[PDB]
From a paper:
Macrophage-expressed gene 1 (MPEG1, also termed Perforin-2) is one of the most ancient and highly conserved members of the membrane attack complex (MAC)/perforin-like (PF)/cholesterol-dependent cytolysin (MACPF/CDC) superfamily, with orthologous sequences identifiable throughout the metazoan. In contrast to other perforin-like proteins characterised to date, human MPEG1 is an integral type-1 transmembrane protein. The mature protein is comprised of three regions; an ectodomain located in the vesicular lumen, a transmembrane domain anchor that spans the vesicular membrane and, finally, a short cytosolic sequence. Each monomer of the 16-subunit ring possesses an N-terminal MACPF/CDC domain, a central multi-vesicular body of 12 kDa (MVB12)-associated β-prism (MABP) domain and a C-terminal region (termed the L-domain).
Indeed, our (ultimately unsuccessful) attempts to disrupt the interface between the double ring serendipitously led to our identifying the MPEG1 L425K mutation as yielding a greatly improved sample and an improvement in global resolution to 2.4 Å (workflow described in detail in the methods). This mutation resulted in two different MPEG1L425K assemblies, one of which involved domain swapping between the two head-to-head coordinated rings. In contrast, the MPEG1 MABP domain possesses <5% primary amino-acid sequence similarity to other homologues and the fold was accordingly identified using Dali searches. The L-domain directly precedes the transmembrane region and includes a short two-stranded β-sheet capped by an α-helix. Within each subunit, both TMH-1 and -2 are folded as small helical bundles. The L-domain forms substantial inter-subunit interactions in trans with an extraordinary elongated β-hairpin that extends from the MABP domain of the adjacent subunit (the MABP β-hairpin).
Residue numbers in the entry: 11 to 614
């Protein structure tokens, strides 16, 4: 009777299913959430009179069709097109080199070029139909507004670390962007993975390699599965043998099946439209005082910074620097940003061992946290490096833990305390000159959220034994040289978001935050908003499957160990405006100059 169905019964038309306004994760090219409010109250149609659109949506009829007879050769996977999200991946931003590189299309493309030494060629029929954009005058959604009125309450009850936790669930549900224009259409793509040596000799006839790749596309679609082709003349007998992989996908329209005339495919584009391109803006662009009218002025510029910080923390994590050049040695497969760490010489370093101390700040009774958090060296004894080494700091933070008393008088009431314990986690560095023995070996780390790539499980190898360093992490270590020399990998040092390692620039801003030359860096155990890394040189830690995207949240949910401070008056000093909250938690109205002076006396 109201909403969509009133416009749909009166008009008898389909609804356009390619709509903007929704969110967009930009690492994994997936769509999620609904940021903008789409209401169908005026019963608008497209100017064709064929679909039904929302009110705050205007369409531009493209009615365009592209048909190319040549494939485009896309070697060197570091710069690639996405064919569905090319306009939103290549924005001018500081993280343009990480966009798109966790989507499902990229992790397939990167694997087939390294595991086969291949290049890729796509050929496509584009069929762009509309361009669907949002108006500038537009309001936020009903559910997206509610979760910004919860970030702005924790920031005014003086609860940081809970407002950071809710701004990292905001990015989990609504992505990093908001699509502001989509493109309803339907492509038809064929990707081939040719062998890379097949292109190097055909420098002149590279225009004939692609001319047969675009003719093998049209014989696959037009003729049936039975080979009645017209392309097998001279060179489409090595081309069939030099290829390593082939697939054909369709994005809109009727489902593709091999042998369907290109006439018959293009008559199913109607009523089956998808976004074959999209553009967008960042997520914190839409947190501003004219999208949120009832909140105060400078309070939504602080929500916009808390949500901006959680997007930049989701791109700083999921960034793997390493040697990207494929023909070189020290090629890191998991790396998705070039570091310049190729062609470097390595130096074998020896490390003393890690240790850790606890302090047990608050809850000295009923919970004893300084047993689980404490760890000694395996080769020294107490909390110290051995004789020829030196300690560095690497991290220091607080481990909270809730418990329960129960004071019975039968009536009983229970009190919920919290027990804190600050832990400091050192590691040792070879100072001047150490002989070849008298040092622990290394067998890789494994956290509780990860695995050791020596044994492909959460376990140290044979002969090795773990020792705890950051309340979940286990460093596999053995002191032997006959039975533990098979699983030993050379070690380059820990560093963090604060303290870089001193093993770069030898014989020594403290230092840089990177590995020495020839070593690859790997993340291990993000521990409350700061990640610690470690440098190795194996090639076994390098290989394997590509890592999935590490989704937020990264902080554990806090234990509410901070009291709330009720804020009433909000002001800025530079234009003399004030927003006085009324009684019984109603709203934020603007402050008249006769009531704020009567309200500052009860504050301070
Ligand atoms: C607002 O919250 C912050 C964060 O907890 C408080 O800052 C800390 O307060 C404790 C209380 O003694 C101090 O020990 C810390 O040194 C403070 N940290 C910093 C960085 O200042 C702050 O006190 C709270 N403000 C109010 C009015 O409650
Ligand atoms: C991969 O491509 C190479 C071309 O770079 C093919 O090598 C040629 O194959 C033809 C087939 O008769 C020979 O006559 C040529 O002498 C080969 N060499 C060159 C330099 O052209 C190779 O055959 C292809 N791979 C497969 C498995 O067929």
């Amino acid at each position: 009777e109201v909403g969509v169905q009133k416009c749909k019964n009166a008009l008898k038309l389909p609804v356009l299913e390619v709509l903007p306004g929704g969110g967009w994760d930009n690492l994994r090219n997936v769509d999620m959430g609904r940021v903008m409010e789409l209401t169908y109250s005026n019963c608008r149609t497209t100017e064709d009179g064929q679909y039904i659109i929302p009110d705050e949506i205007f369409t531009i009829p493209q009615k365009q069709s592209n048909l190319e007879m040549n494939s485009e050769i896309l070697e060197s996977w570091a710069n690639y097109q996405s064919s569905t999200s090319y306009s939103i991946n290549t924005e001018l931003s500081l993280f343009s080199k990480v966009n798109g590189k966790f989507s499902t299309e990229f992790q397939r493309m990167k694997t087939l070029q390294v595991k086969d030494q291949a290049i890729t060629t796509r050929v496509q029929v584009r069929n762009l139909v509309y361009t669907v954009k949002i108006n500038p005058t537009l309001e936020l959604s009903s559910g997206f507004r509610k979760e910004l009125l919860d970030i702005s309450d924790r920031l005014e009850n003086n609860q940081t670390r809970m407002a950071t936790y809710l701004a990292e669930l905001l990015v989990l549900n609504y992505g990093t962007h908001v699509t502001t224009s989509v493109d309803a259409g339907a492509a038809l793509i064929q990707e081939d993975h040719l062998r890379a040596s097949f292109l190097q000799d055909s420098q002149s006839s590279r225009s004939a390699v692609t001319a047969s790749a675009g003719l093998a596309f049209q014989n696959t679609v037009n003729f049936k599965f039975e080979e009645n082709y017209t392309s097998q003349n001279v060179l489409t007998k090595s081309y069939l043998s030099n290829r390593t992989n082939s697939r054909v996908q369709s994005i809109g329209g009727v489902p593709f099946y091999p042998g369907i005339t290109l006439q018959a495919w293009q008559q199913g584009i109607t009523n089956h439209l998808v976004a074959i391109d999209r553009s967008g803006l960042p997520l914190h662009f839409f947190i501003n005082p004219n999208m949120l009218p009832d909140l105060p002025g400078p309070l939504v510029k602080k929500v916009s910074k808390t949500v901006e910080t959680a997007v930049k923390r989701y791109y700083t994590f999921n960034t793997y620097p390493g040697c990207t050049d494929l023909n070189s040695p020290n090629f890191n497969f998991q790396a998705n940003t070039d570091d310049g760490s190729c062609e470097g010489k390595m130096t074998n370093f020896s490390f003393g061992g890690v240790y850790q101390e606890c302090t047990q700040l608050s809850g000295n009774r009923d919970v004893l946290l300084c047993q689980k958090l404490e760890q000694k060296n395996p080769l020294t004894g107490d909390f110290s490096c051995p004789s020829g080494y030196s300690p560095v700091h690497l991290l220091s933070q607080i481990h909270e833990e809730g418990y329960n008393h129960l004071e019975c008088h039968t009536v009983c009431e229970d009190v919920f305390q919290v027990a804190k314990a600050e832990f400091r986690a050192f590691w040792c560095v070879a100072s001047s000159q150490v002989p070849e023995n008298s040092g622990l070996l290394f067998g890789g780390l494994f956290s509780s959220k990860s695995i050791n790539p020596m044994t492909n499980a959460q376990s140290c190898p044979a002969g090795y034994f773990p020792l705890r360093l950051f309340e979940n992490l286990k460093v596999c270590v053995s002191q032997d040289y006959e039975l533990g020399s098979r699983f030993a990998v050379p070690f380059g040092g820990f560093f963090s978001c604060t303290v870089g390692n001193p093993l770069v620039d030898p014989a020594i801003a403290p230092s840089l935050k990177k590995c020495p030359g020839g070593f690859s860096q790997h993340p291990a155990l993000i521990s409350d908003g700061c990640q610690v890394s470690y440098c190795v040189k194996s090639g076994l830690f390098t290989g394997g499957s590509l890592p999935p995207a590490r989704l937020p949240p990264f902080t554990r949910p806090p234990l509410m160990s901070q009291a709330a401070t009720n804020t009433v008056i909000v002001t800025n000093s530079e234009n003399a405006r004030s927003w006085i909250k009324d009684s019984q938690t109603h709203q934020w109205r603007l402050g008249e100059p006769i009531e704020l002076r009567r309200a500052m006396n009860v504050i301070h």
